[PDB]
């Protein structure tokens, strides 16, 4: 019905049927063609709506709103965390002299008497007091999150999840409402992937005990040799 170059995905700014796979009735669902009866409250109006409420926890619209905000905030924090749990180890295996690049050991760097050099450079942050660090952090993050929940110096009458003034959308990527609608989906999908992968970081720490990039490397060395089933008998009750 179309020509070759429209099939091949040319001609940007033809997007109103491309939101159909992420919003609306006939969108992609959590079990795909094997998920018939989506919850009636998951109408397809919000980003990331795949019809997954098996436990019915979001049946109330207001708790659904609160859960959406929880999801997006967790997603953003988990994206930052997934990037930050791999950046030091990547940089250390590329050769930056980070003293403890593994993430679940990265907090114990501040107890070495050379302090917490940021990239392993003593001329950088050079933090020694974990208590002063925590105090600074508590003050700043309390101000920050209280500003988030009602408003602050960066806009008060803005949305609770996507404020998008000149402080939180300073590149203007989301001025087109369709670009905004699909970027919301990209945000929530990358964020759900990051939350799953951060759960994976947690479990791979508690189970394996090495770094996540070290786990990737020892899996790529001999995958069938070394897997999560290698550590299946680790939590044996003795």
């Amino acid at each position: 019905k179309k020509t070759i170059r429209e099939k091949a995905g040319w001609w940007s700014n033809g997007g109103n049927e491309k939101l159909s796979a992420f919003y609306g009735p006939d969108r992609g669902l959590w079990l795909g063609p094997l998920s018939g009866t989506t919850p009636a409250y998951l109408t397809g109006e919000f980003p990331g709506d795949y019809g997954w409420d098996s436990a019915g926890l979001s049946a109330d619209p207001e708790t659904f709103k609160r859960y959406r905000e929880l999801e997006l905030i967790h997603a953003r924090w988990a994206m930052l965390g997934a990037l930050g749990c791999i950046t030091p180890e990547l940089l250390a295996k590329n050769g930056t002299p980070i003293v403890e690049p593994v993430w679940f050991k990265a907090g114990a760097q501040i107890f070495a008497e050379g302090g917490l050099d940021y990239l392993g450079n003593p001329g950088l942050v050079h933090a020694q007091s974990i208590l002063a660090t925590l105090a600074v952090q508590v003050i700043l993050m309390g101000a920050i999150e209280g500003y988030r929940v009602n408003g602050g110096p960066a806009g008060e009458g803005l949305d609770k999840l996507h404020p998008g003034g000149q402080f939180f959308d300073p590149l203007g990527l989301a001025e087109d409402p369709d670009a905004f609608a699909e970027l919301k989906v990209k945000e929530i999908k990358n964020g759900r992937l990051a939350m799953f992968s951060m759960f994976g970081f947690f479990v791979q720490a508690i189970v394996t005990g090495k770094g996540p990039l070290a786990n990737l490397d020892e899996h790529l060395a001999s995958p069938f040799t070394s897997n999560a089933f290698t550590y299946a008998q680790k939590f044996t009750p003795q």
């Binding site: 940021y118 990239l119 392993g120 450079n121 001329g123 950088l124 000149q166 402080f167 959308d169 300073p170 590149l171 203007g172």
Partner: protein, 217 residues
Amino acid sequence: RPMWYPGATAPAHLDGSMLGDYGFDPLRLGVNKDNLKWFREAELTNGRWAMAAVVGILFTDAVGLPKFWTAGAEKYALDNQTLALIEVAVFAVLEGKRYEIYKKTGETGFLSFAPFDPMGMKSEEMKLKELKNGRLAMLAFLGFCSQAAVYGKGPIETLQLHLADPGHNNIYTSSVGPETAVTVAVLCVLPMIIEATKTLNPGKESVPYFPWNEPWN
């Protein structure tokens, strides 16, 4: 209004409409209005960067830090190519927002605040002060680099050298002494030739026959 030399007559395009207008366009680089606006913005951008650079150099030479023409050679937390890549990536978006802001506003902005003016101090007196301090700081950085290339000393060390013997430790006793003396004399006698041109052709403007000027119109 004051001019760049006493009793000068500004060209036809330097109407005084702009700030810092002293009628100085002898090569007639700004006879086009779009070019003149772009050049005002480039003047201000080079001036802001030169102000920041002048204060940074004065700071790093006031304290026990390496000299500014060697600071790039020192060792840092990141290798120079990673620094260059992060700088390119950051400044692509930064100068892109600034370019959009120039195309819209005609003036400067950081990313999304078209005027970066949290503290609302955007007078036109303040624009004039920005422009004048920026010209002064552009000259100041040019001098920093020039008298750190002539000598191997920083700005305030060359200043101390001048103050130790002002009559014998100056630019006209340096390696660039005679060329600068000659260019200064030429500059001081230049405005009399320009005023001869203004005098013998009363109220007429002469095109200097340059490419950018389109002098045939």
